[PDB]
Design a protein around this ligand. Structure first.
Ligand SMILES: *C(=C)C1=C(C)[C@@H](Cc2[nH]c(/C=C3N=C(/C=C4\NC(=O)[C@H](C)[C@H]4[C@@H](*)C)C(C)=C\3CCC(=O)O)c(CCC(=O)O)c2C)NC1=O
Ligand SMILES: *C(=C)C1=C(C)[C@@H](Cc2[nH]c(/C=C3N=C(/C=C4\NC(=O)[C@H](C)[C@H]4[C@@H](*)C)C(C)=C\3CCC(=O)O)c(CCC(=O)O)c2C)NC1=O
Ligand SMILES: *[C@@H](C)[C@H]1/C(=C/C2=NC(=C\c3[nH]c(C[C@H]4NC(=O)C(C=C)=C4C)c(C)c3CCC(=O)O)/C(CCC(=O)O)=C2C)NC(=O)[C@@H]1C
Ligand SMILES: *[C@@H](C)[C@H]1/C(=C/C2=NC(=C\c3[nH]c(C[C@H]4NC(=O)C(C=C)=C4C)c(C)c3CCC(=O)O)/C(CCC(=O)O)=C2C)NC(=O)[C@@H]1C
Ligand SMILES: *[C@@H](C)[C@H]1/C(=C/C2=NC(=C\c3[nH]c(C[C@H]4NC(=O)C(C=C)=C4C)c(C)c3CCC(=O)O)/C(CCC(=O)O)=C2C)NC(=O)[C@@H]1C
Ligand SMILES: *[C@H](C)[C@H]1/C(=C/C2=NC(=C\c3[nH]c(C[C@H]4NC(=O)C(C=C)=C4C)c(C)c3CCC(=O)O)/C(CCC(=O)O)=C2C)NC(=O)[C@@H]1C
Lengths: 177, 115, 177
């Protein structure tokens, strides 16, 4: 069934699909610690709005030139587009966790991101700062160590997935370096 | 208030003409008395309101004249409509093991003006 | 009585349905979590007017081509038709929450809908944007996390119902893709 999700992602147009309980068990047999993995993905997407805005503002917080006149987050329209880019990256990381394979992140998101930003003039060194913030954000939620929110989960250890998401974030920086 | 509905043949797959556009109409009423509160359900015909739809176009003109997006020869990396598309995922933990569901859907990403 | 509700929504001979004080608690006895579920449908149906117009409007600003000449929501006549479609779809999924089952949603509404839009030429990409906004609106109201309005309820957890509404809206998207 995971191929069907891949067929949804790759089809080059808006498309939807879902998992039923019968087919869900096929996924549960296929995945290693699927109980943890699905809870982990929920922990990101359930707070993705909080994560992205803080990281982009955190980038602005340490680098105030980005909001100075002519800056790439100056005037509303550039500011929204940066938030948009943060979301898309974070979403593509989330599916990479769900599939447990980094291919979709590279082939659909990271490919051409280097060439794209330079032609747009996006400062890539600061883009790394925002992504590296989300990696700090994402690890805390999966380990349920966030300061201002604690989640409800069945007891147990989620260390491996926390390391797994870490590699996916680090792929982003290397592509745009 | 006359409206020119589409030909019957264009929706033969969906439903018969004497039942199309009828959808549930639900009213739920709270009162402190468990002996007097009630629920009501019916199917009603939902007609098109030209007056509201005229207003809708007048409000949406603002977006029509704010450009769309930049473009360049780098567009080859976004071959379909996938420019600014990302996968959306939904997860459903619930009180029944068979009712659990998951979703994944490729879709456009935009930030509402309140954020 | 809950059976009577299912009959009218498939257009049986009756004008309307009703449940009395004794019968309402009888219905609540049959449907587990009745009180919260009644609260949940009430929050959605009472805001359906705001939900659809905002969802339609959001769809337009994400792709203003719909209102350009040759666009499917250009003209006053077609714009009314599209608004109607969102109202119909929201009503059906709102009922599915009331019964807690997708059967009427799948059986009375979604079968044959895909072919009809193909015949009518309704662009499937724009529709998925419309449907996905209804989901985001609905989960917010059920969890009382709407930014602009707070409703009064007894405090508690409605996460299960909110994700249950999420399943239904996902079904509409898969059917129309
Ligand atoms: C300037 C004033 C500046 C920023 C603005 C802001 C950016 C920033 N935030 C962190 C650490 C975290 N922020 C997180 C986000 C949230 N935590 C919550 O509970 C809510 C739901 C959510 C939305 C606000 C998280 C999860 C973290 C990680 C905490 C942890 O790992 O223990 C940082 C430091 C991390 C980094 O930069 O990589 C920064 C810079 N903080 C500022 O000072
Ligand atoms: C175009 C520029 C465009 C839109 C306009 C807008 C559409 C949009 N709205 C949301 C989120 C929500 N909108 C809601 C509607 C209302 N909240 C209320 O209190 C009243 C009753 C009602 C009518 C106005 C609600 C409840 C939500 C969810 C909670 C919230 O307040 O945000 C979205 C987000 C959907 C998504 O991310 O896909 C969108 C797109 N945004 C635009 O860009
Ligand atoms: C915050 C992270 C950055 C910031 C980002 C900006 N990106 C802008 C335009 C833009 N970004 C992309 C890539 C994006 N679309 C995709 O499909 C993919 C991968 C799936 C991603 C991640 C594109 C294609 C574009 C151009 C198309 C468009 O935006 O419609 C942008 C605005 C540029 C402009 O308005 O001219 C910004 C501000 N910029 C920064 O400085 C911080 C670090
Ligand atoms: C780190 C992310 C968390 C952690 C994760 C764990 N979840 C465990 C068990 C578990 N998970 C679910 C939900 C899951 N199963 C599904 O079918 C669905 C699909 C939508 C998902 C979201 C359930 C129902 C359970 C059972 C728990 C129970 O019986 O009470 C789990 C236990 C180990 C295991 O089952 O393999 C863990 C560690 N838990 C944490 O505390 C951290 C923060
Ligand atoms: C998620 C939906 C909400 C939430 C709602 C809750 N309401 C609870 C109790 C409750 N609700 C009603 C009204 C409801 N029952 C009826 O018979 C009627 C009539 C149609 C409806 C509209 C009642 C009467 C009650 C009982 C208490 C009272 O008299 O008001 C409730 C607790 C139920 C439980 O789990 O034991 C919840 C959670 N509350 C929230 O925080 C979210 C946002
Ligand atoms: C709005 C978000 C869309 C948009 C939708 C349009 N649909 C049009 C005609 C139409 N739609 C339906 C399906 C609808 N009727 C029902 O009874 C129920 C199911 C029970 C559904 C959900 C039908 C059957 C028809 C044809 C019947 C009729 O028009 O009387 C329509 C007008 C097409 C025309 O110009 O004739 C529109 C614009 N189009 C979009 O681009 C957005 C995404």
């Amino acid at each position: 069934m995971l191929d069907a999700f891949s067929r949804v992602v790759v089809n080059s147009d808006a498309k939807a699909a879902y998992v039923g309980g019968s087919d869900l068990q096929a996924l549960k047999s296929f995945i290693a610690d699927g109980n943890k993995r699905l809870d982990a993905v929920n922990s990101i997407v359930s707070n993705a709005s909080c994560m992205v805005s803080d990281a982009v503002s955190g980038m602005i917080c340490e680098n105030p030139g980005l909001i100075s006149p002519g800056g790439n987050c100056y005037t509303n329209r550039r500011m929204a587009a940066c938030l948009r880019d943060g979301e898309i990256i974070l979403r593509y990381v989330s599916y990479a966790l769900l599939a447990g394979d980094a291919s979709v992140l590279e082939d659909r998101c990271l490919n051409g991101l280097k060439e794209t930003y330079i032609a747009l003039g996006v400062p890539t060194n600061s883009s790394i700062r925002a992504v590296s913030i989300m990696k700090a954000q994402a690890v805390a939620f999966i380990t349920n160590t966030a300061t201002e929110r604690k989640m409800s989960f069945a007891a147990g250890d989620c260390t491996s997935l926390a390391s797994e998401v870490a590699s996916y974030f680090d792929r982003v920086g290397a592509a745009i370096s | 208030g006359k409206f020119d509905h589409a030909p019957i043949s264009t929706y033969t797959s969906l439903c018969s003409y004497d039942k199309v556009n009828k959808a549930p109409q639900i009213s739920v009423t709270n009162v402190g008395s468990d002996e007097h509160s009630y629920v009501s359900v019916t199917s009603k015909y939902i007609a098109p309101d030209m007056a509201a739809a005229a207003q809708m176009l007048a409000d949406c003109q603002k977006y029509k004249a704010g450009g769309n997006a930049p473009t360049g020869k780098w567009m080859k990396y976004y071959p379909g409509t996938t420019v600014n598309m990302a996968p959306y995922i939904s997860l459903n933990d619930t009180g029944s093991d068979s009712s659990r569901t998951v979703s994944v859907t490729l879709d456009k990403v935009k930030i509402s003006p309140n954020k």
